[PDB]
Design a protein around this ligand. Structure first.
Ligand SMILES: NC(=O)c1ccc[n+]([C@@H]2O[C@H](COP(=O)([O-])OP(=O)(O)OC[C@H]3O[C@@H](n4cnc5c(N)ncnc54)[C@H](O)[C@@H]3O)[C@@H](O)[C@H]2O)c1
Ligand SMILES: NC(=O)c1ccc[n+]([C@@H]2O[C@H](COP(=O)([O-])OP(=O)(O)OC[C@H]3O[C@@H](n4cnc5c(N)ncnc54)[C@H](O)[C@@H]3O)[C@@H](O)[C@H]2O)c1
Ligand SMILES: [Cl-]
Ligand SMILES: [Cl-]
Ligand SMILES: [Cl-]
Ligand SMILES: [Cl-]
Lengths: 379, 379
């Protein structure tokens, strides 16, 4: 029987098991892919390590489909793909779930450490794409007040209610960034949080940047933190990572090596999403989800005796992710050579709220917890 | 129908509900009890706020039984009680459970923060009474190596295998204190951990004192910590509490205001134990337990998919108690007037491992977790 010839990155998780259903699978390390590797190849499945150039496709005589198991697609010349009719797809938002649960962990722990309620704090989301909109969904789901800012999408006709920047920077208690890094365009994000903005940030305001490094001027962030007025900053991304300011590090409430979106589920969605895309491209009925591929969580379900309070919410969410874990490892190991990248490479088997089932009675208020991302079960 | 007349401290938890089954209950604040209050009184149930003097019993014409809902009994002249035939009982070990789970939390978090395995660390218990023996049971239950030291009990004929002090101080990684505070006697405990001992403590050794304040010379503890060689100390009790050395405080890994044994269950055991004692004293069949009196825990049961690792153990135990919570509040509030005592008075609804049921399959290894204190259920 004739089959499609599918070239796939060797280290794409669950790739062989999934795509073998769709035809002949060739597994090769993505960094060493040459032009000859695409001879007689119908479809290509890659990660970020493979650059889709003119060079790579020089002998792609059968290439009709290209899928990248990533949320981003800068490693792909998609103007090239477009001009020669090659269908292209990524996995947008494949790792957005982790970021939301990362931000929530940060809020939850800071609430405990500084002694306040998260339901008193207004979160301002700058960047309402895949990541921001999911975070906006989760926070609003449990009844927190969100503030969305997005000048590009608002100009494109997005009819969500957007808050203007200077308003958000004043009206919001917590400021979280979820934008790309851009120097040009109508709405550049390089040093979006600059010196002038930082010094107008109050002592009871929290700044979180788990978007991209250069969005926050790290030098300016340090200067703002060295006043010691109680201003609070959390960085998952650094302006010149893997290098970080070792003077700034002990001033940051939490510091982690670009691992907010990490997690087995999100990593599996990379493969899962482009697999479903290619399935649909072939006209196949096959369909896959990360829940089916992964083993069940260590603590897959817990039971609730009554309705949840803020304390129970902290208890439940920290079963999955506690930001203090990564923070501690990062500070402990960063002095070691290449520890920034090695910590990411050997990241632990982190899950997400969907891996855990919350079982309760109709009087336990699980509907907000379901919107937060948990699986629920009314007894 | 004739009944026993029972005088009880107004603020003893669940006292009226329990003891009303045994006869007439009179509720009066323990600090304001006078001699006249014991006229025609058959039994007395008190806390620490009531001092049992010659003065208090001056008109106790019917007093036959005295119960104090405490583990200690220094507030009681029991030489007086003995010489006039009054049966006396306390509630020994009523709050020992919390201390063990406190110590374990400290070990669990320090293991995460410093990056090590608790199953690599040998815990040396100094003081093998109610508290120490329960801790020894819990740690050995999950497979940790314990080291018991107790010169008084060893001299009295206790045939457990005891380790000599200087040996324990060298052979053990973690040193936890669970002794009373004594200046005299054959085995005094005042400054038991002194200057000479502290300076022979290694950089990879941990010292925990949740026993009594003056057992550790706090001034010497500070001097040892100011070297910055990596030595680690945790205090639940301070030499001159509620006053603490504000120079020592930021050097302590964890600092809490004498709340290790706190928890609803332990607090209820105070009433429960002396109630059962008095029941037995009357020849009654009535019997009570704190589990029946308390509401069920917020998260009363969780399920396990597989056997537990060290990470899962941390996840499970921190559902009940996470020492970082109290530590954060203590450091945040201590500057406030009387915050040391007020934090204890308005302590949160803390539980214990027995309040949570761990459900799994026969292959989940719950037997050690049961010995740790959890309720288990093999499916
Ligand atoms: N730290 C992490 O673990 C982690 C993980 C994944 C993604 N990210 C970062 O997520 C950002 C969000 O990712 P995404 O997948 O949602 O991409 P996205 O493009 O869907 O989202 C960003 C949103 O950015 C808006 N935007 C662009 N410029 C803006 C500006 N100047 N002001 C306000 N909004 C602006 C975009 O138009 C859109 O509204 C990127 O930096 C992404 O790489 C971080
Ligand atoms: N921090 C807390 O929350 C908290 C709570 C309850 C009790 N405690 C402290 O517990 C200590 C343990 O309490 P307990 O109820 O088990 O009392 P206990 O008398 O049963 O226990 C202490 C054990 O102390 C041994 N001991 C006395 N001197 C010793 C010495 N010099 N060296 C080694 N062992 C010695 C006693 O003989 C016994 O073996 C007391 O200080 C108790 O008040 C602390
Ligand atoms: Cl596979
Ligand atoms: Cl990108
Ligand atoms: Cl009562
Ligand atoms: Cl005492």
């Amino acid at each position: 029987i004739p089959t499609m010839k599918i070239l796939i990155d060797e280290n794409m998780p669950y790739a062989q098991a999934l795509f073998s259903q769709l035809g002949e699978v060739i597994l090769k390390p993505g960094r060493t892919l040459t032009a000859d590797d695409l001879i007689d190849v119908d479809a290509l499945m890659i990660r970020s390590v493979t650059k889709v150039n003119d060079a790579l496709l020089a002998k792609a005589n059968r290439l009709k489909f290209v899928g990248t198991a990533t949320a981003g697609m800068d490693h792909v010349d998609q103007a090239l793909l477009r001009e020669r009719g090659i269908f292209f797809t990524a996995a947008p938002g494949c790792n957005k779930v982790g970021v939301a649960e990362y931000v929530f962990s940060v809020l939850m722990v800071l609430a405990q450490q500084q002694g306040f309620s998260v339901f008193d704090k207004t979160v301002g989301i700058i960047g309402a794409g895949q990541v921001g909109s999911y975070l906006a969904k989760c926070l609003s789901g449990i009844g927190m007040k969100v503030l969305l800012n997005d000048p590009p999408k608002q100009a494109q006709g997005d009819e969500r209610e957007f808050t203007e920047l200077e308003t958000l920077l004043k009206q919001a208690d917590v400021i979280t960034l979820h934008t790309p890094i851009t120097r040009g365009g109508e709405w550049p994000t390089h040093h979006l949080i600059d010196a002038a903005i930082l010094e107008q940030l109050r002592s009871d305001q929290i700044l979180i940047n788990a978007a991209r490094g250069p969005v926050v001027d790290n030098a300016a962030l340090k200067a703002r933190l060295q006043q010691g007025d109680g201003f609070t900053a959390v960085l998952d991304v650094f302006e010149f990572e893997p290098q970080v300011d070792m003077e700034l590090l002990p001033l940051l409430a939490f510091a982690t090596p670009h691992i907010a979106g990490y997690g087995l589920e999100g990593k599996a969605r990379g493969t899962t999403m482009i697999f479903n895309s290619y399935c649909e491209f072939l006209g196949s009925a096959h369909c896959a989800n990360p829940a089916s591929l992964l083993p069940k969580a260590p603590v897959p379900k817990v039971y609730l005796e009554r309705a949840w309070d803020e304390e129970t919410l902290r208890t439940l969410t920290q079963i999955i992710y506690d930001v203090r874990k990564d923070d501690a490892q990062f500070r402990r190991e960063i002095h070691q050579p290449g520890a920034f990248d090695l910590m990411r490479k050997h990241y632990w088997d982190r899950r997400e709220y969907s891996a855990v089932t919350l079982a309760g009675g109709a009087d336990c208020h699980l509907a907000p917890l379901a919107k937060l991302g948990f699986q629920v079960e009314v007894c």
